[PDB]
């Protein structure tokens, strides 16, 4: 009575992982100034958003097994590495530095090569204390990234401005968006939706606080791979973004010297004016309000224990300081004033000014990425960013939550948690009463 | 995009399968991440059409086949297949007999082509 009938275009799909191409905004390289993220090559140009609400469709999401975040990690690392190939190589100054010893800068002297292979020039350069390791008055020193890798300068035109990067999908695949409020990122999703392209994920790299990210819809969301495990970082998402203002109020001089044929090495010469420590300002009232909300949300998941935020234990500045990138100058801030309280609540309501230490020998990715040298920026730099999340790390009456800690991927797991790569299978066989070939 | 009516039962969705109908589409890191996707999508589409053509359809969204519905594939009657069953659920139910059904359809189209050639004498 019934006969096979073949349908093409049926709504049948499976979980799959494939290569997702980029689609940046029409600005290309930010009106055509080379971005490290190579965003004019994200050829797709994103004109219109096509979405479909999958009605009566429940799909299971597990943000900790997403391959989108790993693809983002590899793409970001590759884009960062490929931007440093054209730039100057700084092997000539893995050299003994005659640094003047008794501010964090140090006045160092070293013999450096000139454009002629025969001749050598004595150079004076101000190197930060964080970029200097004792060789073991006028003690002798060396750059930190001398016994590990060979550093490469940053190209002057290359700009590290994170602009949105969209992960779109090839034909025959689809991306499923959860659209469900207060999503823990692990479980059933009721209004799953099919999108071609993800929202703009800014490749913002930071250590203890997630800046400029996507902020939650209805409440603060706590996402950890394994709450019982204390080696699993707790990713906090914000309903509302605390505002951080970070400045370097010292006018600096870049005085390029020639260390080879066509190779200019830009060093910090001196400060024209006052010497001022760099800092980042965070309103006390807003920060403590948001931290109280985070403490309540942590009480919900941690047996109503008293939640104690305590400053990071210590180690490398990259690991235990808030690291970010203001205007091409990399900051390493002390968040001890931020994360120091017990709830169940400091009553200050004024600006919290946290010290920051600029670095120049940059290793953003812990060995997987290259090591670079960031040339100084001439004028004073001011960047206005909103923090939208925290990365905590509980340690084993009360639970203590050190800030920071995590992999590089955890910055983008608040972005790619709701997206799932899905393969569409359009062939379908069903019994119907046609009977004709 | 083919995924719109996905919680709808097969009877209600089959109407909306043709409503969409795919009506209109009118060496850096991203250099290869698009070329590989292009080639894979093209060859996947060509494989889908190659399967579709071997059964005699070759360009029909809803294609009619003369293969009788074997009961081992599904004992479910037409009404409870098309009124309380979605496409993912159905293809999961008949996930074990897709290769056999493909072979039967290819054999049936071969038989029909042989009969057509024989009638032409």
């Amino acid at each position, epitope marked *: 009575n019934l006969w096979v009938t073949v349908y093409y275009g049926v709504p049948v799909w*499976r*979980d799959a992982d494939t290569t997702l191409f980029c689609a940046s905004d029409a600005k290309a390289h930010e009106t055509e100034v080379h971005n490290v993220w190579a965003t004019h090559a994200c050829v797709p140009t994103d004109p219109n958003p096509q979405e479909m609400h999958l009605k009566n469709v*429940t799909e*299971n999401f*597990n943000m*900790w097994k997403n391959n989108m975040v790993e693809q983002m990690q590899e793409d970001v690392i590759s884009l960062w590495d490929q931007s440093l190939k054209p730039c100057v190589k700084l092997t000539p100054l893995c050299v003994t530095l005659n640094c003047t010893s008794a501010d964090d800068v140090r006045n160092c002297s070293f013999n450096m090569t000139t454009e002629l292979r025969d001749k050598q020039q004595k150079v004076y350069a101000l190197f930060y204390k964080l970029d200097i390791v004792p060789i073991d008055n006028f003690s002798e020193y060396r750059l930190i990234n001398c016994n590990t890798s060979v550093i490469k300068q940053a190209c002057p035109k290359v700009s590290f401005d994170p602009i949105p990067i969209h992960y779109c999908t090839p034909a025959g695949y689809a991306i499923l968006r959860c659209n469900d409020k207060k999503f*823990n990122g*692990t*479980g*059933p999703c009721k209004n799953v939706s099919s999108v071609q392209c993800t929202h703009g994920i800014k490749p913002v790299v930071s250590t203890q606080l997630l800046l400029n990210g996507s902020l939650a819809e209805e409440g603060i969301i706590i996402r950890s*791979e*394994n*709450l*019982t495990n204390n080696a699993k970082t707790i990713i906090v998402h914000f309903n509302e973004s605390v505002k951080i203002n970070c400045t370097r109020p010292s006018n600096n001089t870049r005085t390029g010297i020639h260390i080879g044929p066509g190779q200019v090495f830009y060093k910090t010469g001196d400060i024209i004016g006052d010497i001022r420590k760099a800092y980042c300002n965070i309103s006390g009232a807003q920060w403590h309000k948001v931290l109280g909300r985070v403490a309540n949300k942590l009480k919900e*998941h*941690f*047996n109503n*224990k008293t939640i104690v935020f305590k400053p990071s234990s210590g180690g490398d500045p990259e690991i235990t300081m808030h690291h970010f990138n203001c205007r091409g100058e990399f900051f390493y801030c002390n968040t001890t004033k931020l994360f120091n309280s017990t709830w169940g609540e400091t009553r200050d309501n004024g600006t919290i000014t946290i010290p920051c230490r600029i670095k120049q020998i940059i290793n953003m990715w812990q060995g997987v990425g290259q090591a670079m040298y960031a040339p100084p920026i001439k004028g004073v730099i001011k960047c206005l960013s909103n923090i939208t999340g925290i990365l905590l790390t*509980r340690d084993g009456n009360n*639970e203590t939550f050190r800030p920071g800690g995590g992999n590089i991927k955890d910055n983008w797991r608040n972005e790619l948690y709701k997206y799932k790569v899905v393969q569409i299978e359009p062939l379908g066989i069903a019994p119907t009463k046609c009977k004709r070939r | 995009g083919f995924l719109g009516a996905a919680g709808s039962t097969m009877g209600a969705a089959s109407i909306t399968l043709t409503v969409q109908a795919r009506q209109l589409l009118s060496l850096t890191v991203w250099g290869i991440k698009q070329l590989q996707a292009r080639v894979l999508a093209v060859e996947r589409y060509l494989q889908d059409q190659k399967f579709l053509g071997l059964w005699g359809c070759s360009g029909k969204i809803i294609c009619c086949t003369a293969v009788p519905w074997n*009961s*081992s*594939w*599904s*004992n*479910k009657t037409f009404e409870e297949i098309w009124n309380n069953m979605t496409w*993912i*659920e159905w293809e*999961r*139910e*008949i*996930s*074990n007999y897709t290769s056999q059904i493909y072979d039967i359809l290819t054999i049936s189209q071969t038989q029909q082509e042989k009969n057509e050639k024989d009638l032409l004498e």
Partner: antibody
Amino acid sequence: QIHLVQSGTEVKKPGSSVTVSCKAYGVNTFGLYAVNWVRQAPGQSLEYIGQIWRWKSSASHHFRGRVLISAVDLTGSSPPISSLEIKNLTSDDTAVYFCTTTSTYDRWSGLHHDGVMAFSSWGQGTLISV
Amino acid sequence: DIQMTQSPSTLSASTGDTVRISCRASQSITGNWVAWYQQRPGKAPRLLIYRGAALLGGVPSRFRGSAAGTDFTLTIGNLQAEDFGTFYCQQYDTYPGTFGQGTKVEV
């Protein structure tokens, strides 16, 4: 891996209510897992009591209204916990009780079907005498 | 609602003797929604086969299954000492899942 442990062994007078606990080690959450409660008689075959699936509680017709199944997923201290509470115990309940969890994450695994699923991870069991 | 029965209520075999444990259903399980278990004495059931003939990880490849309409069979090639124990037949094609009586394999 994954390990299911139940709450020891209890002997109670008829008419009392017994609570069996199911602590699932290795289960990331009960959003992607389903706890299925099954009872084995001392000599007979296994029966099916009820389940929690996507945080929805259900029991078979034989056990409707006479059993309660509750579950809470990962906290800071404890793994996901599932509780089977029988009410109005009778001598016919002298059976071993098992707790099972299956991964309902991917729809094409075959271990689950429309909420009626196989049983993949098995706990030690709480024999109950009454 | 679907009652599944297991062919050999008890069975007798030794090491190296392959046994076919059969199972039949009250209805036609065309979706192959049948699962097989093993219960050693004093232990919990262990899953061996799901979806008719699919094997879990960590289960010996010697266990295999077949699905044909209402007839489901479990074959144990090169039977070994640990394999001895009660085997169960489960269907999850329709609510509620139902278990077969048993097939004890003894030396």
